[PDB]
Amino acid sequence: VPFVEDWDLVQTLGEGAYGEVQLAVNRVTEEAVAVKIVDMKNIKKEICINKMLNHENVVKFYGHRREGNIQYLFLEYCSGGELFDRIEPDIGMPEPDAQRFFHQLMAGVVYLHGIGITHRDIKPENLLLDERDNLKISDFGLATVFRYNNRERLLNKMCGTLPYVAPELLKRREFHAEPVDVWSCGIVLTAMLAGELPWDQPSDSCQEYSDWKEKKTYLNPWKKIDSAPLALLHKILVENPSARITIPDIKKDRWYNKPLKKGA
Numbered sequence: 001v002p003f004v005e006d007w008d009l010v011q012t013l014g015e016g017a018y019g020e021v022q023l024a025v026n027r028v029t030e031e032a033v034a035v036k037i038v039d040m041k042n043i044k045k046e047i048c049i050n051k052m053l054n055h056e057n058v059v060k061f062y063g064h065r066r067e068g069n070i071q072y073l074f075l076e077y078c079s080g081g082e083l084f085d086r087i088e089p090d091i092g093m094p095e096p097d098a099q100r101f102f103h104q105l106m107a108g109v110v111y112l113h114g115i116g117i118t119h120r121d122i123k124p125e126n127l128l129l130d131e132r133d134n135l136k137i138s139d140f141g142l143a144t145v146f147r148y149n150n151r152e153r154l155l156n157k158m159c160g161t162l163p164y165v166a167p168e169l170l171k172r173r174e175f176h177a178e179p180v181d182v183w184s185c186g187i188v189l190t191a192m193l194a195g196e197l198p199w200d201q202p203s204d205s206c207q208e209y210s211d212w213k214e215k216k217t218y219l220n221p222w223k224k225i226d227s228a229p230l231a232l233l234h235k236i237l238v239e240n241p242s243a244r245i246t247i248p249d250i251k252k253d254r255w256y257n258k259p260l261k262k263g264a
């Protein structure tokens, strides 16, 4: 079965910081793939990190090939698109659906953290869905190593997306990598259950963030969220990253372990 690496473009799937992502369809084998096209006239590091990854909740990397100035990355096509488009504005989605996606998100993040990688930009636009609605983490363009030879490195680079970034990234010179990813997962959960982001950024200058710190959960988005997931959010969206809930303890949370959804 030759000619297994000959692709035909069809649709613009999206645009990232470095370039655009297009759907490409194979020749003989009829495989569909996502191809990231960046005009280099950062992606080197993105490719290196992608080569480390192999997990059911991480978008698969197939390979790379450059042509002078234009770098191509070949990646798994997720026909369900972005989680972003499953979130209904001002509504969210059914709690059992949110719970399942959150379970899969945690699985993916545990995997990454276990191999010493932090994503640094978790948000619904970077969480894709395959044909069976399985959630897959994508876009490692801001990802980096925070643990190597069993030694943790503190981060200092401000990066990510403001509504999703943890407060310590705006307040402290250095910070631990893992609690930052945990925080963004909490913002994702909030979005799934409310169809709105709670604040522009987690700063003292942001009224909506002050309200949350004051425990005004009679306001939106919190009043739309049931007491059980809201109790989890209270543990995740903690300002002090050392007091913030860790993933092992998220996995013990009452809502996290609530039977909600029937199998397929």
Ligand SMILES: CN1CCN(c2ccc(-c3cnc4[nH]c5cnc(C(=O)O)cc5c4c3)cc2)CC1
Pocket (backbone or CB within 6 Å): 013, 014, 016, 021, 034, 036, 059, 075, 076, 077, 078, 079, 080, 081, 082, 085, 128, 138, 139, 140
């Ligand atoms: C209304 N439209 C519905 C469909 N939609 C959409 C459709 C497909 C994708 C899509 C599918 N597989 C994909 N596989 C990927 C691998 N890496 C990336 C990346 O940004 O790094 C991005 C992708 C990626 C994006 C993303 C969005 C775009 C909005």
